[PDB]
């Protein structure tokens, strides 16, 4: 898939044997019987990141690995100096910014979110921004319906797909 590029941090460690790393290659059916069960976005050491990092303006963009000064790096985040500077994808105008990723041992992490109470790609308590790895980061949203939506953040028109319960 699009994730197997050398600018993706790939520090994965399925210590609990969930199967989540296999879900990144082959699309897998999640066990729905397990489903029911304001932070700022900065810089994440790549060593705690597995798979692609997405931020949302609310439009989704991928953040690749760099060194701590913003120079792109191509070693799968395996270098101790590799980072993900999330805030370099924040637009200069706008109060809408959040990101989401998987940490090393298979947990979905999040920061930022809508202005405000909703973090990362979640727009409302029932809707999140759709993006190519939503089902891997949020497998319990697999039956959410896709809606074309239009949002205005500080004047600019955003046209994106929202997945909604």
């Amino acid at each position: 898939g699009s994730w197997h590029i050398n600018r993706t941090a790939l520090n994965c460690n399925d210590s609990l044997h969930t199967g989540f790393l296999a879900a990144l290659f082959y699309t897998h059916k999640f066990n729905a019987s397990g489903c029911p069960e304001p932070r700022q976005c900065g810089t994440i050491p790549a060593s705690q990141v597995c798979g692609p990092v997405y931020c949302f303006t609310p439009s989704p963009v991928v953040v690749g690995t760099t060194d701590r000064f913003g120079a792109p790096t191509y070693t799968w985040g395996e270098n101790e100096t590799d980072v993900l500077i999330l805030n370099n994808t924040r637009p200069p105008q706008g109060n809408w910014f959040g990101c989401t990723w998987m940490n090393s041992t298979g947990f979905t992490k999040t920061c930022g979110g809508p202005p405000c109470c909703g973090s990362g790609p979640w727009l409302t308590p029932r809707c999140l921004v759709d993006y190519p790895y939503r089902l891997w980061h949020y497998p319990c949203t697999v039956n959410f319906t896709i809606f074309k939506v239009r949002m205005y953040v500080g004047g600019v028109e955003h046209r994106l797909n929202a997945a909604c319960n």
């Epitope: 050398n6 290659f25 082959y26 059916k29 395996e78």
Partner: antibody, heavy 127, light 108 residues
Framework: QVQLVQSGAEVKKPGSSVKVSCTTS????????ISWVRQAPGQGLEWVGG????????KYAQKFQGRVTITADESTSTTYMELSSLRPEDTAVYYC????????????????????WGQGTLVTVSS | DIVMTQSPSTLSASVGDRVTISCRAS??????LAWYQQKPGRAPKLLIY???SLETGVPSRFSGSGSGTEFTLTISSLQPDDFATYYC?????????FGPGTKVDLKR
């Protein structure tokens, strides 16, 4: 509380075939790649084959080329090992275990046979 | 094909001893080596992967060392639960291959 449950013991004449199953329950995902390892009476462990967690296609020790076919029923979380042209030395306890992608290096990821294993299936091949 | 061998084939030691057992690969296998423990009549158990990484839940008295073609497993202080047969195993995308195993029994 994932569990792997194998089908029951089998008795076969030489030259026949046997099809053993492994069903997963209690999992985070409905299906897992499964591999098979056997142990003859008094002997060591011998990998036979299973489904790859990357390609979701069978992979075998090529010692078994042409008489092992591995298949999977996605709707029943079951994987099957069919071993043909059976010979007395195929008499063994056959275990299954998830072939699970565990860690990555340099963009390449590696899978291990991880806990829990199935309980074992005795297959006896004899006239 | 890559062939795994182990030494010694059997070892008698006491509770509390330091034990080191060895595994050799016919060709270079980098760090793609794992150790499994097996008690008679039961399924094996993964202890170590990537030559030296402990599997989740495995006591710290276990350790592994080596790279390339020479590997060891070490038990810093043998305990009653440790008497068992230990198999090394090379893994890659295409196959797994087990070594012949080393049986450690309790000396009395």
């Amino acid at each position: 509380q994932v569990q792997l449950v194998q089908s029951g013991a089998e008795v076969k004449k030489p030259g026949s075939s046997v099809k053993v199953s492994c069903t997963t329950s209690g999992g985070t995902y409905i299906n897992y790649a499964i591999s098979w390892v056997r142990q003859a009476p008094g002997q060591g462990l011998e990998w036979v084959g299973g489904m790859s967690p990357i390609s979701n296609t069978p992979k075998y020790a090529q010692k078994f080329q042409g008489r092992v076919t591995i298949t999977a029923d996605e709707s029943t979380s079951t994987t099957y090992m069919e071993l043909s042209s059976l010979r007395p030395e195929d008499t063994a306890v056959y275990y299954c275990a998830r072939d699970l992608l565990k860690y990555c290096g340099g963009g390449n990821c590696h899978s291990l046979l991880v806990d829990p294993w199935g309980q074992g299936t005795l297959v006896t091949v004899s006239s | 094909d890559i062939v795994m061998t182990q030494s010694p084939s059997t070892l008698s030691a006491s509770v509390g001893d330091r034990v080191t057992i060895s595994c050799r690969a016919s060709q270079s296998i980098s760090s793609w080596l794992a150790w499994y423990q097996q008690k008679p009549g039961r399924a094996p158990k993964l202890l170590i992967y990537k030559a030296s990484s402990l599997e989740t839940g495995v006591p710290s008295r276990f350790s592994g060392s080596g790279s390339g073609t020479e590997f060891t497993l070490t038990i810093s202080s043998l305990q009653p639960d440790d008497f068992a047969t230990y198999y090394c195993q090379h893994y890659n995308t295409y196959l797994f291959t087990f070594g012949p195993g080393t049986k450690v029994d309790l000396k009395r």
